[model samples]
Target: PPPIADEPLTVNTGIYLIECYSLDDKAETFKVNAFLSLSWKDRRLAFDPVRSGVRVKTYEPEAIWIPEIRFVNVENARDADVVDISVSPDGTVQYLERFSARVLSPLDFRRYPFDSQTLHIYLIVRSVDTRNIVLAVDLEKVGKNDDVFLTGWDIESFTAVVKPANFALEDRLESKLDYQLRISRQYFSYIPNIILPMLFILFISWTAFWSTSYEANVTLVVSTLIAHIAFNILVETNLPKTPYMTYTGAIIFMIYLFYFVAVIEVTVQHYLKVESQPARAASITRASRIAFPVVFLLANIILAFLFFGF
Candidate 1:
């Protein structure tokens, strides 16, 4: 119809993950070997690959005059080798290739071990001056392996989306296409190791309220406090330093607050008993026996909802 359509042309691109793994949260990077196939209608290149047994006398993407596409956000690109190319008799060019790269993904560890994250590999057109190429993904090819799973992560999902370049700089609008793959990460290995142990230590604090001796109660609560602080510190050492508070941190803080309350209650009870008000002291201790567990459980629910439910 037209020599070259002045309007932006949609280029159908496909993504196939060869082997995707090695999600490092501390470093905030994920490695992937993937294939990116680009298909576009170019009436200029009129040839048949099946009949000619070759795709329009294939030339290097750069060597040949073509729209320039680039993987703009790749961190450490290892290999970007071309696999196949074919130009149909109708003038549609299909270019297939594999790219091995480590991509930077900003990770939010606000939930830490209980978090799910998305690894984004962004692609952008190098220049807006040439023919405007819109990027589109073939849903069928965008995927990951079932067997290849990271140590502390479960491969949740693979998705791709395209967004028009609406970046405004110096009050000037630039035209570009944006394509990105979203690899969702579901964290594993924190429940049994961290949460359960923390819960157990919380349970241990209950023993202090039951003891007859005030000295024994104070000693037990203080020891439990120390134990939890140590465990929380150790767990944090393995995680990245984040400015925001986390779900696990909330749990640790709750336990510490519980211990502090216990110390206050026990000391007050001892003071009352020494002052000869044994009846009031006994009544307060009895109320705490039931109150502590209930309050602790309710606080857990609130924090858990804020951290994990969302």
Candidate 2:
């Protein structure tokens, strides 16, 4: 049986909320081109590829409805395809292009708070001798913070004329395209992976020196210390703009504190050697040997908290 033709189809045009972060501390500008796309009841969009047995989701419903529209990282966009404009294998307009979104550009989105903002958009449908359909996009939200720099382009810099001079064939367009824009703030992981491990490992190396009785091993201890310090610097260099007292920072600092204890133990042992206090030195060494390992074990346990509980 043939399907009914009177079914009124709904076309949803929405923008994806995306934020580009400056992975490095260097001040840099970026040209962001948010490709435009429309989706009605059938077509879905794909941004990233399917991975392994599991696939991560980026965009949806909006992806399946229509065709792709490139923002051009500029202020203006022309209609590239028609909504529901599917061609048959034999090359026929199985479905005619309906409404579309209007995109404007060089969108003078001034240097802004990398935070989220909102903007309206429009779509222009396919056209020929007569006119094309003009449609306004629906609401989409951008969620983030103020950090990234604008490559000198943005969404709010322009307006959608609601009416595309040539399109607006009948009344499928929306009243307005509105939503909140935000800078995505999801990449702030620091300290735990870099800092804490560094500090703990530094302490582990320092212990080797403190426990050594022969002065010959002193050079080995110094070498180990240099390695630890170098590691500390490396960890610091890799972190992102983070908040103070992060769980990661806390654990890292704690590990470094353990390292301090190891150094102290070595200092005490060295002094004991100088005084020739054999019995007392043995006792102190026993205390330190046990204390350092116990403390290090405890620190290891504490490191797990940095990544959990939000």
Candidate 3:
């Protein structure tokens, strides 16, 4: 048999890149699969490993790929036909994997066995191309947020890198590939600022039982309770009815229970107000203080039911 070509394509660690869609989504980090291949000089007489397990790869910024990804023997090198890829952009990647991976193939060691190894890869994206675009002047002039981290390697810095770091060209051939990923800012955020004020407003009604006459207490509590009910309804109508116990659900139930306790207090105080005497008020207040503890125990059951049922 004749040797393939004067030179064989070399397979290296830097084979593919799993494009990043967003910084916030951890799911996107490992969302890619990748590979590497080399051609034999004879074109048809290439050397390929029986499987990718023959060698491994790593990153080096100065070098997009490492050749001695662990050493290999001649027989094994011929079978070194696999590249495994899991991408979490530590924005400061030491090297780039040559092949884009979402699909996988085991090395066909028996047929068309790839001879020699060289890293050649192409990227395919599910969405628009987001690579190599210019930033607005404001973004360019201002540095990234202090918390941003462009790559996993940056973890060594103990500090994050730029929010959006672009990739440099490895090979012009790869430049032709189209790939892009976009993430909406608000989608994964905590319901913070919205929640803080709502909580404050709710606690105001909860604390109101300490003030004024029974009628006033009852009026205010009832009004606040109705507002919470309406808010719950609003969320239900706007969002899909999934089985998840929402953050909204916790807030609503707590608000509703506070009013339920107020309602009970208000009804008792109404009867006492009719007595119109301080001695009876003292006696009833003393009893309520003792009864409140027992009632509170039952309230735990309500919370348990809501949270546990789910």
Among these predictions, the greatest lDDT belongs to: 1
> What order do candidates take by TM-score, descending?
1, 2, 3
TM-scores, all candidates, are: 0.79, 0.41, 0.35
lDDT of 3 by residue, 1-310 (tens): 2222233222212222223212212111212222232211223312233443233234232333222232111112222333333212221112222332332211111111111111111222111221222111222112223443333212111111212223444431111221122222232122443445455556556444455376676667677777666666754553444444444555456557766776776666667767686566656555655454445446546654554455
Off by over 4 Å in 2: 1-12, 15-34, 38-221, 246-248, 306-310
Q: Where does candidate 2 have its weakest 10-residue lDDT segment?
A: 105-114
Error of 3 at 228 (Å): 2.5
TM-score attained by model 3: 0.35
Candidate 3 residue spans exceeding 4 A from truth: 1-192, 230-240, 275-310
Q: Candidate 1 residues 11-77, lDDT tens each?
A: 6666677776777766777788878777777767676557666646555676334554556566654
For each candidate in the order shown, give its overall lDDT on alpha carbons: 0.69, 0.40, 0.36
Compute the lDDT of residue 150 as modeled in candidate 2.
Answer: 43
TM-score of candidate 1 on Cα atoms, chains taken together: 0.79
